[PDB]
Amino acid sequence: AILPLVEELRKLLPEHRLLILTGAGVRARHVFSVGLDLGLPVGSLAPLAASEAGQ
Amino acid sequence: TNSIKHVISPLARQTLQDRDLTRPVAGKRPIRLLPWLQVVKIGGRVMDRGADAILPLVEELRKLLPEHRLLILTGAGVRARHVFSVGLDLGLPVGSLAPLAASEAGQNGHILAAMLASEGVSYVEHPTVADQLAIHLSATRAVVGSAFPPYHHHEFPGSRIPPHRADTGAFLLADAFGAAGLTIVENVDGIYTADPNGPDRGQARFLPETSATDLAKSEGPLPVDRALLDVMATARHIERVQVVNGLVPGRLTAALRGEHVGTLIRTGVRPA
Amino acid sequence: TNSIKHVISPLARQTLQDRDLTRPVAGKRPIRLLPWLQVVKIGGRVMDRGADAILPLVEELRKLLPEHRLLILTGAGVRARHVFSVGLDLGLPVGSLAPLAASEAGQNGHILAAMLASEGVSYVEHPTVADQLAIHLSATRAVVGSAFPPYHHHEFPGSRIPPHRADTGAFLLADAFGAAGLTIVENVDGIYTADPNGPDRGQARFLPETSATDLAKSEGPLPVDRALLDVMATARHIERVQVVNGLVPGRLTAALRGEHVGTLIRTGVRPA
Amino acid sequence: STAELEELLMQRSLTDPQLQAAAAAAADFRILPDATVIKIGGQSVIDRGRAAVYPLVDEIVAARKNHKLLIGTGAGTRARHLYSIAAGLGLPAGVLAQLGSSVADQNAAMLGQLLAKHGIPVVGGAGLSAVPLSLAEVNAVVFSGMPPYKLWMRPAAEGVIPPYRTDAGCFLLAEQFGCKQMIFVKDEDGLYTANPKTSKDATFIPRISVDEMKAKGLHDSILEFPVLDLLQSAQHVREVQVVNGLVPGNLTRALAGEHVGTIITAS
Amino acid sequence: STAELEELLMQRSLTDPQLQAAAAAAADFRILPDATVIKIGGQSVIDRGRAAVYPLVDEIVAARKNHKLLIGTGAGTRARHLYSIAAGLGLPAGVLAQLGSSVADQNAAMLGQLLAKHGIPVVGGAGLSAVPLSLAEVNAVVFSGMPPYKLWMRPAAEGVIPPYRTDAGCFLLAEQFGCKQMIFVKDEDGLYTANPKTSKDATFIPRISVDEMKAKGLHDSILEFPVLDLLQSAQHVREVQVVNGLVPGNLTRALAGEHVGTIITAS
Ligand SMILES: Nc1ncnc2c1ncn2[C@@H]1O[C@H](COP(=O)(O)OP(=O)(O)OP(=O)(O)O)[C@@H](O)[C@H]1O
Ligand SMILES: Nc1ncnc2c1ncn2[C@@H]1O[C@H](COP(=O)(O)OP(=O)(O)OP(=O)(O)O)[C@@H](O)[C@H]1O
Ligand SMILES: Nc1ncnc2c1ncn2[C@@H]1O[C@H](COP(=O)(O)OP(=O)(O)OP(=O)(O)O)[C@@H](O)[C@H]1O
Ligand SMILES: Nc1ncnc2c1ncn2[C@@H]1O[C@H](COP(=O)(O)OP(=O)(O)OP(=O)(O)O)[C@@H](O)[C@H]1O
């Protein structure tokens, strides 16, 4: 899914000025499962998912 | 003895008139050279109003440059009508009048480029556009040009009025380059059923959307050429063209962003 | 019957000779197209010295590019004097000599551009200066050109010597473009009361500052044309022009920054 | 009735039919009414070389003494090579046109080098080359047939092959400058029912109209079909003649008005 | 035997000697066989001004009534100034060529302004300027001399001075267009053993070949030496004549084939 997307973007750059923001996905679901098993509050989980987005 | 010296090729010994022999070679759909290009055709009736209409337009464009890579083509306007008046009094044929109007287009373009020079914009002649538009656009963001196509002494007959005018040339360019979009700027909100500046303006009803066929199969005036519709029928890349009023701020910007602020004309293209 | 076909406009039915009728339309002060432009006219007497004077100058310019957007216009020098001597032996009129000198200017420019090419500099010919200057400067930082204006066979009569030379053309350009500044580079510290290379060398007093009028009313030689002093009076944007010696390093760089290192000539322009 | 024309021109749009009808009612001026246009095929003639070109040069040097000649060149097979290449890449009709223009210009250069000793030049400016067309010492010019629509070429319904090529360039140059006759010099006696080089049963055709020509549903023609729609829509030149330049005298006889080969009439 | 030529052209490389030999066996076509090329020195003639130019203008307007004339101009001393400058700067031969082309064009412009009242124009396109040559009331043109090799010049073995200057331009224009006669108008009666302006013991030379000219090991010549290698390799024009344009009549006598100055023969 990424390689086609990457080519599309490669073809879009000269057309637009782009800010491409990524999301987290499933790893965030895992860290949620864990943090909830531990009883952590939502404010403790937010950054943990932001990180998967950043990666 | 006097046999022909052929260069070996798939199209050798052909006349290029038999489609069954060219289709295996040239029967496929072409590519886009400048798919990242946006084309904007300013009408001459706009530029003829002067500062009152140009300065706002100039500021809008100034704000558009960092957003798009622009080819701004201009039209002729009323001076072309005058030169037609004269040339017809003299009995000149349409091929004699075509360049005389292309020139008024080019002068409008020179004007606009003078107003935009502070931003890195300049006017480029028809050969520069054709052969080398990519570099002139890698340097700067927008370039201005003339919309009338160079059919000057070779224009099509049938009418004493050149049928291939600014709109047509802009579309032909855009569809050749495979541009992202063509946008037309007029002095009216869009296309109607009749000239709203004419006698039957009371019955004129706005058309937010339509097809090239519905218009070409109709009769009556238009803010755009009919040859434009004829070529739309044979387009390859461009699927829609938006006609918008440039006297109204913000509509050109929106149109470049794909908004439906004026009239949409669907071509004969079938998307995937 | 044979009446005139007019195009409706404020200036219709006018000759453009009656100022009372044009002033309501054209009597206002114009705008600046390239207000961010700096113009530098190199004299030909400089380039005629060769490497000894050009290489230092070239390094200075190399160090100026990232600081300014430059139009470097060259002058003719002595080859033009030779072609004048010949054309006068032949009895040719001034309009026939003008282009012959413009050419020597252009060749000096080609030389300089060759020396600066490594930095992205090139020579334009003059159609391109008039129209496609903004883009050629959005690509790179400096461009070289000829200073002699194209009055080649349309040169003004009265003198067997083309009065409209490099200085004049540079100023006319700059004042049209509304440029930020015009700077002239000569082989002398500036302007004097008399030629410091001539017989009156001893009575020559340096003039750090003066006006175009004080000079035009005067009589005697100058390192600059007198037509320059005539056009200065009709200037619109340029308020001062600095003449500096390019054989001395750092003076050009300073002049571009507004320092008083040579001679300052105030035009007829009134500031705000 | 020019006042109505003027007020319409200034007010209405050029798509206004009242305006088009007013304009059609205008005068008709012929710029080179005494001139004759001929198109020398590239693939059919020039690409044959000496045997087909020297005789034609003779015929031309001979005819210019009694006629006024605008000689347009064709492109040939180099253009077909280029078209094949560029189509293999998917490049559009405009580019192909840019390319064929050059082939037509090369052939013109060759012909002009052949004819220079006879005072016949090569002109970018065929219509307004007033001097050569005026002097009986010259009375002829060589131009190159491919039209100026370079990149703005109207593409065909199907494909990237430019439909308007040398044939159309020459014909339109004739119709514009009000020339008296238009001739196509090629490698066949005229138009048949089919390409005689492929089919041997192909039947000759001495005369025909455009409508009949379309009704025949020809798969291949000796002319570009768009030229027919142009001819049906022209004002000055209403017929063209196709002849064989390999046959000596055919061109000279045609210039005199004879019916040598095939004649195609708008109506 | 053209089929072998064609198949070789399509298959082999143009360096293939079989191909070069086939090509040499081809035909020859002279484009302006009745034309005569002359070169007006810039430093030797034009840079002298009135005294040397007005008489030549007279001679030319006189001679054009019996000969076709292609008058190429030389550059002169302005070019030498430019070369000095550009060499001091270390710029290459191509640039210097770009520069000298211009001096030659200025001189041509001057000469054309002198000759316009006589119907003699200045033409870029000199060889195919067919019209003025087909006419007897013009029968001449001025084509500035410097060649088009502007930045692609073949540099010399040593230095940045362009070796193929005006002399070569005129001579090659002659050889190409198959002209009948090639003349160099300069400030000396012809070729000597040494520059007479510097060595008054130098001996005149009425006639000589290229081989003998090299064997003499001339330090300086009245022609560019590369022109000799070109002349030894030409096919149409096999000899040139150098004359003095300051002497009245010499040019006219030469155009008539007379031997008045120095004659240089390839063989
Ligand atoms: N009403 C709905 N319409 C469409 N899809 C839905 C709907 N409801 C749920 N989905 C599902 O939700 C999934 C996306 O979930 P989510 O938005 O969390 O992932 P994402 O946005 O791609 O990742 P991230 O949240 O990290 O950006 C889709 O795969 C889709 O199948
Ligand atoms: N059906 C219609 N719908 C809308 N406007 C129409 C229609 N028919 C005619 N017009 C009129 O046509 C005018 C535009 O004419 P035209 O298209 O020749 O000018 P332009 O395109 O702005 O200039 P140029 O032709 O030089 O590009 C508009 O001002 C409009 O009033
Ligand atoms: N009043 C004066 N003050 C200073 N210099 C003068 C004066 N009068 C004459 N000169 C001399 O004029 C010379 C410059 O002449 P000129 O302006 O024609 O050359 P240039 O401007 O360098 O070259 P070009 O004219 O091609 O630009 C200087 O070298 C200077 O010695
Ligand atoms: N119906 C037909 N009648 C006659 N000739 C035909 C017909 N159909 C095809 N042809 C062929 O078409 C050829 C001419 O077309 P072609 O374009 O190849 O040559 P040309 O047009 O003279 O050259 P160019 O296209 O380069 O100008 C002739 O050689 C002929 O054999």
Ligand SMILES: Nc1ncnc2c1ncn2[C@@H]1O[C@H](COP(=O)(O)OP(=O)(O)OP(=O)(O)O)[C@@H](O)[C@H]1O
């Ligand atoms: N061996 C020689 N015999 C005759 N003249 C010679 C010889 N060597 C040098 N010269 C000199 O060379 C000069 C001609 O060469 P030069 O190139 O200067 O003039 P030109 O070629 O006519 O001008 P341009 O080079 O500008 O076309 C003559 O003035 C002549 O005195």
Ligand code: MOO
């Ligand atoms: O060979 Mo062409 O391109 O049909 O004239």
Ligand code: MOO
């Ligand atoms: O003076 Mo020349 O003609 O450049 O050798």
Ligand SMILES: [Mg+2]
């Ligand atoms: Mg054909």
Ligand SMILES: [Mg+2]
């Ligand atoms: Mg319109």
Ligand SMILES: [Mg+2]
């Ligand atoms: Mg007037």
Ligand SMILES: [Mg+2]
């Ligand atoms: Mg000066």
